[PDB]
Structure 1
Amino acid sequence: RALWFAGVVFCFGISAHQIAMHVLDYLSEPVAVRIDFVAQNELRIPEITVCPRIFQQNTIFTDMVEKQGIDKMKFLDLIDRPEYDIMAVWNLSRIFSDNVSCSAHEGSSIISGSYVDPNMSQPHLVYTTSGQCINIPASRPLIYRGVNTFVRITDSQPRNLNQVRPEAIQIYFHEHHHAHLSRYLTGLRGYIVPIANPFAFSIRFTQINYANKTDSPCVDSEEYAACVEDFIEQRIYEKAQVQCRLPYMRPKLPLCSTPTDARKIFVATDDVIQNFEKESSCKRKCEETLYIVEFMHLFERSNISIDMSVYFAYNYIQVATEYLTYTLRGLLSDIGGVLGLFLGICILSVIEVFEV
């Protein structure tokens, strides 16, 4: 009976190996991606940060610093003079007046006309590494009534001919409550547009709903934003080796009073915002919206200085949803199948063996 026992042990070994592999596969939680094209009646506007060009590319700030006798690429030296402070050095980069309106034109009606909703999340002041910027929270989702839906950022500043006036701005569309993106990466990930002519963008939406797993955990939008903001600030402070902050930093430490400290912080933040995408520690989000930006063309030319439009005309959002493809039912079915192939013992056999 030696051969029969050898066959029995071989069958037990193969069955044990197969059940172990099945259980490991279930534990790994394999996932599959379902791609849908969902048409919504209300689009979630991305948060918009409109900055001036970076300090070096900015024309007004560069002209001011040259007028003060200090060449660009080293503007931070302005902090040395008692009449200039970092807050003032960064308020000099302001490009939008107090008359900044963010209208929301949601389609049109064949009987009444076009809907205009000027009371749409009026822009507020933010401090970016590019200077002083305008942030536009997405207070409510825009009702999509047609390809005429858009958001119009318009500033009618008294653009007199006495002084040189801006030739470009940097507009960045990002997640709703990502303070780090608005205050650090607008200068890098913001599309440059001229204000001389009324511009118009177009936004398509690719939503990605990842899956929360043991090896790829999730964090809500707030958790991810807080994680990345804290990581960026702590990394900047570690790199700069200084107790400081700059207008683009949370009120944690006091502003620098000397150019050296500010320049060290600036270099540190440059390196961080450059290399933080891969070296960040906190986990990804599983509600990740991508705003594909195309370039519309405007037939209507307005006389407002900084007329700007962003059109949301495509309501078919591409939703990529990740779902678990292996369940407990499937694992039990596969285990029972392998048993019926190799061992051929149900739980009744186990009960009989245990009793005896």
Structure 2
Amino acid sequence: RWQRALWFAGVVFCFGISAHQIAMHVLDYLSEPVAVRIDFVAQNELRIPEITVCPRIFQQNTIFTDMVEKQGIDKMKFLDLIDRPEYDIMAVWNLSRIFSDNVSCSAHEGSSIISGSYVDPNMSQPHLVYTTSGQCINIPASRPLIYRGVNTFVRITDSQPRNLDEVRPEAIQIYFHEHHHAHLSRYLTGLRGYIVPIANPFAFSIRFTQINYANRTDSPCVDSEEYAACVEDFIEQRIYEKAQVQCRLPYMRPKLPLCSTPTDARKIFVATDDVIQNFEKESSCKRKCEENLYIVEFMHLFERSNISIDMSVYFAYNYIQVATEYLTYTLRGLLSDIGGVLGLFLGICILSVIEVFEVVIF
């Protein structure tokens, strides 16, 4: 009656509250909550990024536009000349050449008190690579730089003889990309690169900031290469599927031949523009499990040099921010909270449950 009814009410209230708490915990585990731990991991060997050093886009280029005007065309219609038998799109995109052979990058690491800065010229030297911006040079930046001092830079240089044989370049475009993803160089160097003047010797400082996202069912992260591969394939195919044609331009990898018709070359170029502008939205990939963020700030330099193009990139800060989205609510945590709630709104343990099971088996 009274007593039994109230006892049943209380017991059912206890089970109801425990079940509601456990259900909320279970629903919390299904949607993995994520927190971020940010620490500064000082490393002695800095992983230098792979600098891309492009000229300004053909339209904004000085020397290439000068050649196009010499042939008698305006700053726009240089693709109305490629299928001319000798210009051979390869030789059109060789007219954007802003760097000459002598390009070489050194890797100064220390400072020394007798000799001076440790000039180490055996580091991976730069190679010329085609890009939407034209014909650039990619800085491999392969081996790591042993950070010792605030004077730890790679000094790119080019001693192109600047005699009055033809007008000479005004500025270049610098983009700091990651080791071996080919879409960063050949496509995204006209957008994400800094336009800086070669008239005077210009420097940089780079502080590295790394964001890491954990694998998670409702927000997955792919490794370094797989995102690059998916994005590059998307960009190359939709150029084809958005130009509704079949041919390529130097910045594309050798799938098909080189557009033996100017209208199709223009279609490819325009589709490239349209897809590169907004491949973040149209794509279906997500940021890597790592995310390098180079905080590139400028500086003045300590000495002049009569060199056509000069460039320093300082890495004086060896403490790198490391954000790491991580697993904050594990399955062990769920089981422990379930145990806590069943032992807090009750007296049930993992020994009483087995004891009742034993009683069931008589």
SS in 2 for 1:347: coil
After TM superposition, the structure 1 stretch with the greater mean CA deviation from structure 2, 214-223 or 269-278, is: 214-223
Question: In 2, are the aligned partners of 1:51 and 1:170 still within 8 Å (CA)?
Answer: yes
Question: In 2, are the aligned partners of 1:159 and 1:305 still within 8 Å (CA)?
Answer: yes
Alignment match, 1:23? 26
Q: Distance in 1 between matches of 2:331 and 2:273?
A: 48
Pick one of 164, 176, 179 that aligns with 1:176: 179
Deviation at 1:12, TM superposition (A): 2.2
Cα 1:113–1:79, aligned 2, differ >3 Å: closer, same or farther? closer
Structure ranking higher in helix proportion? 1
Q: Distance in 2 between matches of 1:55 and 1:162?
A: 21
Deviation at 1:274, TM superposition (A): 0.7
SS in 2 for 1:108: coil
Question: In 2, are the aligned partners of 1:231 and 1:280 still within 8 Å (CA)?
Answer: yes
User: How many residues get paired?
Assistant: 355
Q: Distance in 2 between matches of 1:333 and 1:350?
A: 16
After TM superposition, the structure 1 stretch with the greater mean CA deviation from structure 2, 333-342 or 296-305, is: 333-342
Aligned CA RMSD, in angstroms, stands at 1.6
Deviation at 1:216, TM superposition (A): 2.3
After TM superposition, the structure 1 stretch with the greater mean CA deviation from structure 2, 57-66 or 108-117, is: 108-117
Deviation at 1:353, TM superposition (A): 4.2
Deviation at 1:112, TM superposition (A): 4.1
Question: In 1, are the aligned partners of 2:55 and 2:96 still within 8 Å (CA)?
Answer: yes
Q: Distance in 2 between matches of 1:310 and 1:106?
A: 11
Q: Distance in 2 between matches of 1:104 and 1:46?
A: 13
After TM superposition, the structure 1 stretch with the greater mean CA deviation from structure 2, 50-59 or 18-27, is: 18-27
Q: Distance in 2 between matches of 1:125 and 1:332?
A: 58
Deviation at 1:4, TM superposition (A): 3.2
After TM superposition, the structure 1 stretch with the greater mean CA deviation from structure 2, 121-130 or 78-87, is: 78-87
After TM superposition, the structure 1 stretch with the greater mean CA deviation from structure 2, 155-164 or 165-174, is: 155-164
After TM superposition, the structure 1 stretch with the greater mean CA deviation from structure 2, 342-351 or 66-75, is: 342-351
Q: Deviations over 1:240-281 (max 9, x none)?
A: 110011100010111101111011111111111110123321
Deviation at 1:160, TM superposition (A): 1.7
Alignment match, 1:199? 202
Question: In 1, are the aligned partners of 2:68 and 2:75 still within 8 Å (CA)?
Answer: yes
Deviation at 1:3, TM superposition (A): 4.0
Question: In 2, are the aligned partners of 1:65 and 1:75 still within 8 Å (CA)?
Answer: yes
SS in 2 for 1:127: strand
Deviation at 1:237, TM superposition (A): 1.2
Question: In 2, are the aligned partners of 1:149 and 1:313 still within 8 Å (CA)?
Answer: yes
SS in 2 for 1:88: coil
Question: In 1, are the aligned partners of 2:96 and 2:135 still within 8 Å (CA)?
Answer: yes
Q: Distance in 2 between matches of 1:201 and 1:222?
A: 27
Q: Which runs of 5+ in 2 are unaligned?
A: none
Pick one of 225, 230, 233 that aligns with 1:227: 230
Deviation at 1:341, TM superposition (A): 2.8
Question: In 2, are the aligned partners of 1:202 and 1:293 still within 8 Å (CA)?
Answer: yes
Deviation at 1:40, TM superposition (A): 1.8
Deviation at 1:229, TM superposition (A): 0.9
After TM superposition, the structure 1 stretch with the greater mean CA deviation from structure 2, 288-297 or 26-35, is: 26-35
Compute the TM-score of the two structures, normalised by the length of structure 1.
0.95
Question: In 2, are the aligned partners of 1:177 and 1:221 still within 8 Å (CA)?
Answer: no
Q: Distance in 1 between matches of 2:97 and 2:329?
A: 55
Deviation at 1:212, TM superposition (A): 1.7
Q: Distance in 1 between matches of 2:257 and 2:303?
A: 47
Q: Percent identity?
A: 99
After TM superposition, the structure 1 stretch with the greater mean CA deviation from structure 2, 282-291 or 162-171, is: 282-291
Question: In 1, are the aligned partners of 2:39 and 2:321 still within 8 Å (CA)?
Answer: yes
After TM superposition, the structure 1 stretch with the greater mean CA deviation from structure 2, 60-69 or 215-224, is: 215-224
After TM superposition, the structure 1 stretch with the greater mean CA deviation from structure 2, 119-128 or 31-40, is: 31-40
SS in 1 for 2:266: helix
Q: Deviations over 1:296-350 (max 9, x none)?
A: 1013110010111111111111111222222333222211221123233223443
Deviation at 1:9, TM superposition (A): 3.0
Question: In 1, are the aligned partners of 2:142 and 2:179 still within 8 Å (CA)?
Answer: no
Q: Which runs of 5+ in 1 are unaligned?
A: none
